[PDB]
Amino acid sequence: SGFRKMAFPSGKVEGCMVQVTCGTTTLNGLWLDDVVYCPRHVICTSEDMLNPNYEDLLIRKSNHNFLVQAGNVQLRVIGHSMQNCVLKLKVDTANPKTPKYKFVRIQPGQTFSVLACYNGSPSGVYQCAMRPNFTIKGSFLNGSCGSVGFNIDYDCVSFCYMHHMELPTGVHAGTDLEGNFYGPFVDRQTAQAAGTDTTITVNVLAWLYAAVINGDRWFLNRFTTTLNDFNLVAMKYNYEPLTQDHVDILGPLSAQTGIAVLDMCASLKELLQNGMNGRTILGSALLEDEFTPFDVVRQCSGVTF
């Protein structure tokens, strides 16, 4: 028993992190086979970042201008190209620690682990969710760009996020590994803000199932509800609509606990309308929305990789 915000083991990703330096700008790169992926603003001075022309800055660089370091070994760069907001540095050595991997673009509400890195070295790992407004609530300082977010399926690392920048409220924005930003953001130092965020309803329900599994049951009420009546209530409280797809994804937890999804929705509806009356669920005074149904099943069933 017990329920914790849990990250994937980071070793497979740790063996891929490198330092990339251009001029005096240094950040992190991801070394897979013979390619290093990193944010394109490695090629900017601080002044360039206010309004950069990346294509123009890159034209003036050659391979030897990129200093890539894997531990104490410098990797010789033998080609370079830009793909959207990421640079790809071809190097003359394949990373022998390359895991089986894929590049994926995740959807809002999905979670992933972040390996926060500085100067190519890992600092910590934490679990994040892609918010409905396409930001993540991360923890990042200067030099953290190029840190990546990932999921693991058995032996395969699915890379889904590379870190580029911090927005007002101290939230974070980045790209998939093809360099396309999540959300309507650009890699330029000019005022930008995220839209209003919303609560990931399907994840709250998953977390309520985790609570029941752990014996935290006080919030269960005697009632059911229709999907449409639940969604009318949730809307007022800035909760995402619950779709039939979400209901299906909640099936395994519903079947395991013996609580129909719409019955749990009736319990959540009461929690939203009445509040928690000074009580906690799994130790939390606020409803938690950064566990997916899959996260709950994995943690309560001990899936390994």
Ligand X SMILES: CC(C)(C)[C@H](NC(=O)C(F)(F)F)C(=O)N1C[C@H]2[C@@H]([C@H]1C(=O)N[C@H](C=N)C[C@@H]1CCNC1=O)C2(C)C
Catalytic residues: 41, 145
Angle in degrees, 0-180, between the axes of helices 201-213 and 293-301, rounded to the nearest 10: 20
Q: Does 229 bind ligand X (CB under 6 A)?
A: no
Binding mask 92-131 for a second copy (x = CB under 8 A): -----------------------xxxxx-xxxxxx-x---
Residue 58: both structure tokens together: 């890159």
Cα 248 to Cα 137, 237, 260, 267, 289, distances in angstroms: 27, 23, 11, 18, 18
Contacts of residue 102, Cβ cutoff 8 Å, sequence gap at least 6: 156, 157, 158, 159
Angle in degrees, 0-180, between the axes of helices 201-213 and 261-274, rounded to the nearest 10: 100
Q: Which stretch binds a second copy (CB under 8 A): 73-81, 137-145, 190-198, 263-271?
A: 137-145
Q: Does 138 bind a second copy (CB under 8 A)?
A: yes
Task: Report the alpha-carbon distance of residue 271 to residue 214 in Å, rounded.
Answer: 19
Cβ distance to ligand X smaller for residue 215 or 275: 215
Q: In the set 35, 58, 125, 167, which binds ligand X (CB under 6 A)?
A: 167
Q: In the set 45, 69, 119, 166, which binds ligand X (CB under 6 A)?
A: 166
Binding mask 129-158 for ligand X (x = CB under 6 A): -----------xxxxxx-------------
Q: Does 67 bind ligand X (CB under 6 A)?
A: no
Q: In the set 172, 198, 231, 240, which binds a second copy (CB under 8 A)?
A: 172
How many beta carbons lie within 10 A of that of residue 156, not counting itself? Answer: 13
Contact residues: ligand X, CB under 6 A: 27, 41, 49, 140-145, 164-167, 172, 187-189, 191-192
